[PDB]
Amino acid sequence: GPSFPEPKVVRSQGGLLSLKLSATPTPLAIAGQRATLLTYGGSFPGPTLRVRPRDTVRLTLENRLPEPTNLHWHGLPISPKVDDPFLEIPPGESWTYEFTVPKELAGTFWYHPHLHGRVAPQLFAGLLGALVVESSLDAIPELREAEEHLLVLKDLALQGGRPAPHTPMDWMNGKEGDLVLVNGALRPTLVAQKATLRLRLLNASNARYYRLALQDHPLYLIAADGGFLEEPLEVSELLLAPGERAEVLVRLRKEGRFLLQALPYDRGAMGMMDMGGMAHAMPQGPSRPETLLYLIAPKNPKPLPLPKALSPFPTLPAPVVTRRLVLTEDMMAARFFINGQVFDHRRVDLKGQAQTVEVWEVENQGDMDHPFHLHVHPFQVLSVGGRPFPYRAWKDVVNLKAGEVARLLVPLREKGRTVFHCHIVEHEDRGMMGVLEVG
């Protein structure tokens, strides 16, 4: 096949993407070994769904797992009566998700399980896939002529030909695996045919962070989780926390082989040590560096000029309320809290008004990084750690290091009950989630 493996794409046809996917234990070849994973559509990752604004999506999910499951349409500003985080599809049963893709939308999104208490093992086992919303912006020459690829960043650990089970330490830290894969492949080679690459990036890992850097090259950020920036932003590196997406342009500068690496990053994961009276928690420190893929540039690369503009960011109405949400930890209990409470599906934590704008101040009072995710209502990150964000774009996950406060501008869109939670999914399963009702 193609030197660079990417998930098979399923495209809408005549404005309709109608598809049946099964969630199923699936024997497959992975990183040179045979393993049984849990997959959508018989593959890992699941198929990439490619749609345009105003398309209808009709996705029937058949549950062939021995436990209940559901789907979260991560990042899609649709109704929480469709993207329903409380729905359970029992084993053997099916459910059809039907929605219209919003008109003002573009970027890389994804789908995965969201059944409280069971997300971490289901996602770790291989249940996830991408969804791309194509834009009229993709037709401008500076993007149209680029070579485009999707990179699904997901790690895995295998034991006895199956996903490794969660340990107690895994529930505390979030589980990371030794197999650090791209599109389910181990350090694939991307032999570029064009000098400009457009890469859609997705961190679909449970807990692993990717401090991305391409040898000898900057990256040009053109989209965040939920939409384009207003103009390209040059960066030396790009951190992708669990659940985040980004799109970058790469402008290959000369012939040769360039490594795309996940550089060392300390997210505050913890170990245990005993030093003669100890038996106490100790930092794991930074991750070991990982090579994600080998990028081979073509001969005499002459990259395209960058687009001078992308999409203007909407002018939002003045906000009508300010919220404060404080994240804390009980590491040894592996319990995680928002404003001193654990999730309760029956309890409403915030009540807001549709079509108003709110300011959310999310403060991390723990020692671990926590990537904070809000369903249904994409937000504009104003600042984090007291540093203004260097661009305007829609996001739906924001990483907070220990001590940091993020200030978000949150326009409330669809009415209904939905959730916000840490996207280290073990933390969500262990209580770090709350309920927002919009009316």
Count of residues interacting with ligand OH (CB under 6 A):
4
Candidates 9, 16, 278, 320; binder of a copy of itself (CB under 8 A) is: 320
Closest by CA to 165, choosing from 108, 120, 196, 208, is: 120
149 is in an annotated binding site: no
Smallest gap from residue 322 Cβ to a copy of itself (A)? 5
- What's phi and psi for 230, nearest 5 deg? -80, -30
- What gap in Å lies between CA 106 and CA 431, rounded to an integer? 32
- Within 13 Å of residue 176, how many CA atoms lie on the same side as its CB? 18
CB 398: neighbour CB atoms within 10 A?
A: 26
Smallest gap from residue 317 Cβ to a copy of itself (A)? 11
Judged by beta carbon distances under 5 to 8 A according to partner kind, the member of Cu ion, a copy of itself, ligand OH, none in contact with residue 424 is: Cu ion
Q: Which of residues 360-379 bind ligand OH (CB under 6 A)?
A: 373
User: Is residue 321 a contact point for a copy of itself (CB under 8 A)?
Assistant: yes
User: Is residue 72 a contact point for ligand OH (CB under 6 A)?
Assistant: yes
Judged by beta carbon distances under 5 to 8 A according to partner kind, the member of a copy of itself, ligand OH, Cu ion, none in contact with residue 200 is: none
Q: 250 is written with which tokens?
A: 């790469």
Q: From residue 433, how far is each of 76, 282, 429 by CA, in Å?
A: 19, 26, 8
Question: Pattern of binders to a copy of itself over 239-278, x per CB under 8 A?
Answer: ----------------------------------------
Element (H, E) at 414: none
166 is in an annotated binding site: no
Burial class for 246, CB neighbours closer than 10 Å (0-12, 13-18, 19+): buried
- What gap in Å lies between CA 88 and CA 91, rounded to an integer? 9
Q: Which of residues 214-243 bind Cu ion (CB under 5 A)?
A: 243
- What gap in Å lies between CA 64 and CA 74, rounded to an integer? 22
Smallest gap from residue 205 Cβ to Cu ion (A)? 11
Q: Are 340 and 328 in contact (CB under 8 A)?
A: yes
- Residue ranges binding a copy of itself (CB under 8 A): 320-322
Binding interface with Cu ion (CB under 5 A): 74, 114, 243, 370, 422, 424, 427
Interface residues toward ligand OH, by CB under 6 A? 72, 74, 114, 373
Binding residues: 72, 74, 112, 114, 280, 370, 373, 375, 421-423, 427
